[PDB]
Write a protein that binds this ligand. Structure first.
Ligand code: COA
Ligand code: MG
Length: 218
């Protein structure tokens, strides 16, 4: 039934909430990050971290703050990878152990057309042609955007480098998979090279959810 669980492997626990339940609070160490933030931002930050801590507990990790690094990335415990996402109607998180996977990214977007002008900013010309050829009945522009954001979230923990929308070609399959091909140098922090990612996607509840797992080194 759950969206994240439908697009990631069983060994990565996940949790998701569609509303902000009453009474949640950040951990004390997290409060400074949202002390001057509007209510919508506070709620998304707090609720998503409740989900992340639930998933962490399945791995046997007890309550821990989830702070943000220099580029906004979540700072997980040593030995853990994970990803979080929040949009109106969705907060979700997934975590895993570094002994089982290398990286994970997820992203939820509303299943609506992109705002005016955004497709031109995020798509390669060839991608625009590809999207126009896909079957009618899905907002392929929004799916592409979501998949590219997930690509960055899986890439950044392994490279510590920017990846722009123009720096990867994403090909969407109607069957619920996609691929991301990196067009820039793919050197990762540990000396390996990233060149392509395999992704999965689902549309339900008026939402798109995309996910990439970078698998354990073969
Ligand atoms: C960072 C980004 C991908 C977030 O995606 P989004 O769809 O806007 O927002 P989401 O709600 O899905 O995800 C937000 C969460 O991403 C996570 N995040 C932020 N920066 C991150 C990073 N550098 N690496 C990994 N995860 C990151 C955080 O946990 C954040 O939630 P928090 O602030 O409550 O901790 C997006 O805002 C962005 O800046 N994109 C530019 C880079 C990009 O997408 N390149 C395309 C590559 S092909
Ligand atoms: Mg999003």
């Amino acid at each position: 039934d759950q969206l994240i669980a439908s697009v990631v492997p069983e060994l990565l626990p996940s949790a998701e909430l569609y509303e902000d339940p009453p009474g949640l609070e950040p951990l004390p160490e997290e409060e400074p990050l949202i002390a001057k933030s509007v209510a919508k931002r506070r709620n998304e930050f707090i609720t998503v971290r409740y989900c992340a801590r639930q998933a962490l507990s399945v791995l046997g990790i007890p309550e821990v703050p989830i702070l943000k690094g220099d580029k906004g990335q979540p700072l997980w415990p040593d030995g853990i990878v994970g990803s979080m996402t929040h949009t109106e109607g969705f907060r979700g998180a997934v975590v895993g152990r570094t002994g089982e996977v290398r990286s994970v990214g997820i992203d939820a977007e509303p299943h609506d057309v992109l705002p005016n002008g955004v497709l031109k900013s995020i798509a390669l010309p060839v991608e625009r042609d590809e999207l126009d050829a896909l079957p009618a009945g899905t907002h392929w522009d929004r799916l592409l955007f979501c998949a590219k954001e997930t690509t960055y979230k899986a890439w950044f923990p392994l490279t510590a480098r920017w990846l722009g929308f123009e720096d990867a070609h994403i090909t969407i399959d109607p069957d619920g998979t996609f691929t991301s091909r990196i067009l820039v140098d793919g050197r990762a922090n540990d000396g390996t090279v990233l060149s392509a990612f395999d992704g999965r996607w689902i549309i339900d509840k008026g939402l798109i959810l995309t996910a990439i797992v970078v698998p354990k080194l073969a």
